[PDB]
Design a binder for this molecule. Structure first.
Ligand code: SF4
Ligand code: SF4
Ligand code: FES
Ligand SMILES: [Cl-]
Ligand SMILES: [Cl-]
Ligand SMILES: [Cl-]
Ligand SMILES: [Cl-]
Ligand SMILES: [Fe+3]
Ligand SMILES: [Fe+3]
Ligand SMILES: [Mg+2]
Ligand SMILES: [Mg+2]
Ligand SMILES: [Mg+2]
Lengths: 626, 626
């Protein structure tokens, strides 16, 4: 229908929306329509439920009533506190993610994690040395891992003046954060401090609240997320370029299909390993299947793509539709971004919905809890449940639409530097020559308010045509992949300068740099280029964009990008427009404080113009043309 | 006047409400009226703003529209997540408070805190030995302090299996918490995990969410709060019984009046010291003042009262009225429960409003930031500001409405045990013999929804009449004090059994045990009684009540009491009634899980009946026949 066509740009999404219609299954778009119009105070941010003197709403009434909350707080404070707690929730998602990796590395170092290993010993020794572990180059690997675990845990404590990985940022940027009171000190400490500041009668100054929101977000980007990324590479391997495929057509009628969903590779890597064990494969063959087929959703999907080349079935708004194919024999979830509607949709089929984390509980799910000491045994058990469920698939309701689209994944910073010959000199040369005018990270989600992937795809296409290389993470990965942008032959979609550089290196014009925690790789790349050139991150020809964001996590990434000096575009506004002062600080005031600001623009072509304009202005201050 | 009499039971409040109305000053009661009726969804908890797929509201309609959020979350999940973040904000308040005490003790141990010292060396050595410091009885005090600092900081890290002070709880309770997954592990860690669990698509099971809310609150009561109480006693002295006074009449027309407000004695103790320096007093005399008079508000007032006998001007809803006397020359604020309306009310007079914490910023305040290394110099500057403001005081606008009333304060557990002769045996014997039926801690706030202190005082009177001894903390202290119940002669208002015990010890029937963090003293006392008798806390004839609560901190206290086995009454419901399942768990289901539950009851006589009924049942669980 016209409604279905308006919900997504993709053929596979349309086919499943028609099928969900015929089967009477409601989707995220139907619930979004039920929640429109939204509450006007909630959307503006001018409501507070932080104590039971309230709840309070701030209105503009002719009688002048409801200008203040019961405690006396005005719209500036109420909006800034709501936004601070919103950012803290996003930082906490990445923080707990990093913490789980520390605990997994510790279990490996203690010999208490069967099936887990140090997959990248060289990176372990390099990271440990960088952070100050003595004799990291020569001591037994597990001893070095134990000392690296201690350093990472200290960043989740309360005794540091600055996070360990902050040393990567250029000195000028660290000096600025120190003057501003933005230096992140402890990953959990800043989240806790934000929750204290936002209690009634604590922080009642919108500027101070926004400064701490920046500090809390920096504790994610340079702490929780960066620890998460670097330890994931140590446990599961540093990504290198590899071929794979994307879209609902990666599911196979002839195989047992297991979709992995959520964020943490500690689970999805062990599910993949279980499906490769000979006795498990034989059980699938006895059931009538040709093979076992693992396919990724969302960030845990990105993790398996980066390190194992596992095909990705879809991003956020495809998740329900992947079930509607009728071919999902099990969905294995850990935590974050897993819509609870998936439990009810899975119950419309034979599909098993399996939870694995004590943090990600879903009423009605089959819970098989996974920890380092038992993952090998439990993941074997979960794959066996998938195989059993396959025997009851209803073949009449199977509709796998579309043929999969080829992609190239695996662009860690290590992989980029290797393609360049071991130094950033050829990339710097390309930027100085104007062949590559700048870089934009396009990150984040889908949102049913925006036709799915329409802005993600349009923005990526516009930027590469203007010789701006795109670094893609998170759910943008699937959009760029389905648009044919993630392969070396996509150099033909870029402008003449970027196409030539890509062809000379053999890489695509859009580089998949990983999951949402892997936005930390973009910070590390920026820091390296700034330190190499002797400038600040706020001087580099860079930008960031989340055209279709929805999550608290995406807002935390955008805040840490801005506070690190990267101009950051959002397709939709956070719930802050009820305060002109908070809004003006996010869109304009921060520009002169931290060197960058937020932009809000729902037209992806106009967003391309704004990101390009910031890049051009930064090129001028480096003394470059174009 | 009938409206004014409806707002408070107290003459001093009545007098200042009349003065405020005559002067056009808006109070918390006026703003509460403007915010009534409240938003129905906010009040019920059936609204969510945790992502920009929303905001979402949940209705209960026969057609089933707006039954779910855009992500699919139902009322049970939305309500439980909202209550979880509510609890996390309260735990965070106490956590940051405890953290600041660690940092101050560290500064003393390093020799970098002029004017601070270890005031109670004997308690330092006992606490350090209790928590495992080697040779705590003989090593240099600064070495012992440094080792205790390290233990406390490790509780603010991510490597423990259980908080250090949790060892005080009886083994049976520790075993239950461990099996339930409720054991608190790290003070900041549990807060961060709550914020992770409540992100879209993480924890989507209301039972799981409430269990982690209990774990988060327990990390406060046995962690942040207990650390704060024990280190405050080490740095500033263990409280011992002493007489003082209460009400607005503690302000003096002929003196420079400095009100300390907020929570942290690290500031208020140094303000007090500054007012005693000879040169500062000479400056006050040069201005025409007879004295410099410090008086307390809210929790920091409680702290100075407990350790220094400093008179208390009022509790939460008295704070605006204290400025309306016209005699407040400065308000010196740190953080928490400081209504921002105080800045505007101060600007109606000569009063200086001074902020001292980087966490407690108020737009328009005079900021003089205080840290251990500079407090001596900065507090002197703050007192000079107050003296200058005194020279600007308009005598025509002064109305100090009452004469103060005597109270006894200082009942730390050390003081109680000393009064009992060194052991708890005389108290246990009185309970066994039925002279004291049980104990109730009455804790927490005021709330403009309830006539001020009406339920606090009526519940206190009802309980002592039934031979139930009351332990009072927080803003209830001022209520019981103004009612005349904090003195030994108030035994005449108790039942025959309690009166006889009180008279035999020379103590009041209502024992002031300190500020809100000092509810940790009640946990310690319950744990000692249960350990001595060989039972659980959930077997003791104890209860807790906050008849007039408002804050996230009060909800966290109630939750940690319930989770520790103490039945807890609340005068008003949290914003949870939109979920019958969450409400039933809070009020009934938790009884099976943790051995105690919440009660919600606005009639304080009925609340007394309910607390007494739990006490009767616990006496039967102990086999008592008296
Ligand atoms: S913190 Fe202030 S604005 Fe928020 S609900 Fe409480 S009284 Fe209202
Ligand atoms: S988390 Fe779910 S219920 Fe909450 S605002 Fe987002 S879509 Fe709505
Ligand atoms: S639902 Fe209560 S203000 Fe939006
Ligand atoms: Cl800058
Ligand atoms: Cl810029
Ligand atoms: Cl008296
Ligand atoms: Cl029990
Ligand atoms: Fe994501
Ligand atoms: Fe309090
Ligand atoms: Mg500062
Ligand atoms: Mg400038
Ligand atoms: Mg600039």
């Amino acid at each position: 229908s016209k409604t279905i066509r308006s919900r997504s740009i993709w053929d596979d999404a349309h086919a499943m929306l028609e099928k969900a219609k015929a089967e009477g299954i409601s989707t995220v778009w139907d619930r979004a329509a039920e929640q429109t119009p939204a509450c006007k105070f909630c959307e503006l941010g001018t409501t507070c439920r932080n104590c039971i003197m309230g709840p309070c709403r701030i209105a503009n009434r002719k009688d002048g009533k409801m200008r203040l909350g019961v405690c006396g707080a005005d719209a500036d404070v109420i909006v800034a506190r709501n936004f601070g707690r919103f950012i803290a929730g996003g930082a906490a998602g990445h923080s707990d993610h990093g913490r789980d990796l520390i605990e997994t590395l510790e279990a490996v170092a203690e010999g208490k994690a069967p099936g887990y290993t140090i997959r990248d010993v060289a990176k372990l020794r390099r990271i440990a040395a960088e952070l100050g572990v003595a004799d990291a180059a020569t001591r037994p690997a597990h001893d070095v891992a134990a000392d690296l675990v201690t350093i990472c845990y200290n960043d989740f404590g309360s005794r540091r003046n600055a996070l360990a990985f902050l040393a990567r940022a250029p000195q000028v940027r660290r000096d600025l954060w120190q003057r501003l009171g933005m230096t992140p000190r402890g990953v959990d400490r800043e989240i806790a401090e934000m929750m204290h500041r936002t209690h009634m009668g604590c922080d009642n100054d919108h500027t101070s609240l926004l400064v701490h929101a920046a500090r809390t977000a920096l504790a994610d980007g340079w702490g929780g997320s960066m620890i998460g990324t670097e330890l994931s590479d140590i446990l599961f391997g540093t990504p290198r370029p590899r071929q794979s495929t994307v879209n609902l057509g990666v599911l196979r009628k002839d195989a047992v299909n297991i979709l992995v969903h959520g964020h943490n590779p500690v689970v999805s890597e062990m599910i993949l390993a279980a499906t490769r064990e000979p006795a498990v494969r034989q059980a699938a063959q006895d059931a009538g299947a040709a093979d076992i087929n693992v396919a990724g959703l969302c960030c845990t999907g990105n993790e398996l793509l980066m390190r194992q080349g596992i095909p990705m079935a879809g991003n956020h708004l495809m998740t329900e539709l992947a079930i509607v194919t009728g071919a999902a024999d099990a969905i294995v979830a850990d935590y974050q971004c897993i819509m609870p509607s998936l439990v009810q949709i899975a119950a419309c089929y034979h599909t098993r919905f399996v939870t694995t984390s004590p943090k990600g509980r879903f009423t009605g799910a089959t819970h098989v809890e996974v920890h380092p000491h038992n993952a090998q045994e439990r993941c074997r058990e979960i794959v066996m449940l998938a195989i059993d469920a396959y025997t009851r698939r209803d073949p009449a309701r199977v509709d796998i639409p579309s043929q999969p689209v080829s992609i190239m994944s695996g662009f860690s910073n290590e992989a980029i530097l290797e393609a360049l010959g071991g130094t950033p000199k050829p990339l710097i040369d390309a930027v100085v020559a104007g062949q590559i005018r700048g870089f934009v990270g396009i990150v984040g989600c889908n949102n049913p308010k925006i036709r799915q992937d329409s802005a993600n795809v349009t923005l990526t296409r516009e930027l590469i045509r203007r010789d701006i290389m795109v670094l893609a993470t998170g759910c943008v990965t699937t959009a760029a992949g389905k648009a044919g942008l993630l392969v070396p032959e996509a150099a033909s979609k870029a402008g003449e300068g970027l196409a030539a550089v890509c062809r000379s290196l053999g890489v695509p014009p859009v580089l998949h740099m990983g999951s949402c925690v892997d936005n930390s790789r973009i910070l590390q790349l920026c820091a390296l280029l700034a330190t190499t050139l002797g400038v600040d991150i706020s001087d580099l020809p860079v930008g960031a964009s989340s055209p279709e964001w929805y999550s608290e996590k995406a807002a935390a990434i955008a805040m840490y990008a801005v506070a690190s000096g990267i101009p950051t575009h959002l397709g939709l506004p956070p719930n802050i427009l009820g305060s002109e002062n908070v809004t003006a600080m996010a869109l304009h005031g921060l520009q002169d404080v931290v060197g960058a600001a937020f932009m809000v623009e729902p037209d992806p072509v106009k967003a391309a113009d704004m990101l390009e304009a910031h890049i051009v202005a930064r090129r001028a201050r480096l003394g470059l043309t174009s």
